[PDB]
């Protein structure tokens, strides 16, 4: 069984620059006057797509920004210049022997200029409340880099439990991330308080970005 080792597992490349992805095979993948290493691209929510077959042949309709080379046990996929839409995981596969095991994949991240998040806060809907629950939701949108922290406050007091956060896949247009933070309460606890606060702390600044609402007026 031929094992394929991709390197690096992760890389971040700026628009207009080169991404070099290696795939190493444990035994040669060459025979018949050819080299049976294949490269595929996988974007979130899509089936994989063939880029390069038999080491160096561009699949029809795949742009020449993608280039394959190598032989024997050492192969390279080069994306040059990288474009926003290249955010994906890239896999090698050999077919010189069965089983045709994939490499572990290389996740390509687009590097771009640091950006602070936009914060939106949303009270529980009437419908959810009428049903006995209450989720308070905060969106932290269009920031870079990925790492970010959120904190919740209820009437000025920090709340730890009930918090779940989910990040998007890097956007294929502006190369930003977003994330949702959801505070889950019982209706009865929600209804016993006035002001709800979502504080985002992103490395882009020392000062949090704060959004709030009050239950006590409108």
């Amino acid at each position: 069984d031929i094992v394929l080792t991709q390197s690096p597992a992760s890389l971040a490349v700026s628009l207009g620059q080169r991404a070099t992805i290696f795939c190493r095979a444990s035994e040669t993948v060459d025979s018949y006057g050819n080299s049976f290493m294949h490269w595929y691209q996988q974007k979130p929510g899509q089936p994989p797509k063939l880029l390069i077959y038999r080491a160096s042949n561009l699949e029809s309709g795949i742009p020449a920004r993608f280039s394959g080379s190598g032989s024997r046990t050492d192969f390279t996929l080069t994306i040059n210049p990288v474009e926003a839409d290249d955010v994906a995981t890239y896999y090698c596969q050999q077919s010189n022997e069965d089983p045709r095991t994939f490499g572990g994949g290389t996740k390509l991240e687009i590097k771009r200029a640091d950006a602070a998040p936009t914060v939106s806060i949303f009270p529980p809907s009437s419908e959810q409340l009428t049903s006995g629950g209450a989720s308070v939701v905060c969106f932290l949108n269009n920031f870079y880099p990925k790492d970010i922290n959120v904190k919740w406050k209820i009437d000025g007091s920090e709340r730890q439990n009930g918090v779940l956060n989910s990040w998007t896949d890097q956007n294929s247009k502006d190369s930003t991330y977003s994330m949702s933070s959801t505070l889950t309460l019982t209706k009865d606890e929600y209804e016993r308080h006035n002001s709800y606060t979502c504080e985002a702390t992103h490395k882009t600044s020392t000062s949090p970005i704060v959004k709030s609402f009050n239950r006590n007026e409108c």
Binding site: P47, E127, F139, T168, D169
Partner: protein, 219 residues
């Protein structure tokens, strides 16, 4: 994707069995090798089985060897994958792919389906509750406005949210929460167009045969 169409994916009890199908629409399987591959919720993309044109050769990953059977019917233009002794980690989206047909050795997979989702679990199918996310009545309105839908308490994966039929959307991946998934979706739009114009999220949960609308009304 259009050319290949997987079907048969379903929720299945651990230890159970299931049979997937893959039909060509606008292309023939005759003459070509074929493969099944799967993407789990996250291990990496995994190849699991191939079968020769004539069907007298097949090969499996160790992971599925002995449990799964690949087979085909070139007359009916269909590929199959019989699954048995299903386990938790067989949970994945399963794709079929036709190998290129070049002479001079083996081939890459050039035509792929959209996939069919298989879940192996003892939990029960549950449709989503869909709650609107709209700004609080005290929100200082800006140039544009962000709206969302919170899709809560469903099983198995996945759902599809569609805003006003056919951009400025974000899709927050689902998280498993006490046996049930929650996800949310947002859309951002100019203040001049909502609430003056209708905004609606339509959430499909194929597993429970359910579609839930929500018209976003102002708070």
């Amino acid at each position: 994707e259009v050319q290949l169409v997987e079907s048969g994916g379903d929720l299945v009890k651990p230890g159970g069995s299931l049979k997937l199908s893959c039909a060509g629409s606008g292309i023939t399987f005759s003459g070509y090798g074929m493969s099944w591959v799967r993407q789990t919720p996250d291990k990496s993309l995994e190849w699991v089985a191939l079968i020769s044109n004539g069907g007298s050769y097949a090969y499996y990953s160790d992971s599925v060897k002995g449990r799964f059977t690949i087979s085909r019917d070139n007359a009916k233009n269909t590929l199959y994958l019989q699954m048995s002794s299903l386990r938790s980690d067989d949970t994945a989206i399963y794709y079929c792919a036709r190998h290129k047909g070049l002479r001079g050795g083996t081939n890459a997979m050039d035509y792929w389906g959209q996939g069919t989702s298989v879940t192996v679990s003892s939990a029960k199918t549950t449709p989503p509750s869909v709650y609107p996310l709209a700004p609080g009545c005290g929100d200082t309105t800006g140039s544009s406005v962000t709206l969302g839908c919170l899709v809560k308490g469903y099983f198995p994966e996945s759902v599809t949210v569609t805003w006003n039929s056919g951009s400025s959307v974000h899709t927050f991946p689902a998280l498993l929460q006490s046996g049930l998934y929650t996800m949310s979706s947002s859309v951002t739009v100019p203040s001049s167009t909502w609430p003056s114009e209708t905004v609606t999220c339509s959430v499909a949960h194929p597993a429970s045969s359910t579609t839930v609308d929500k018209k976003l009304e102002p708070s």
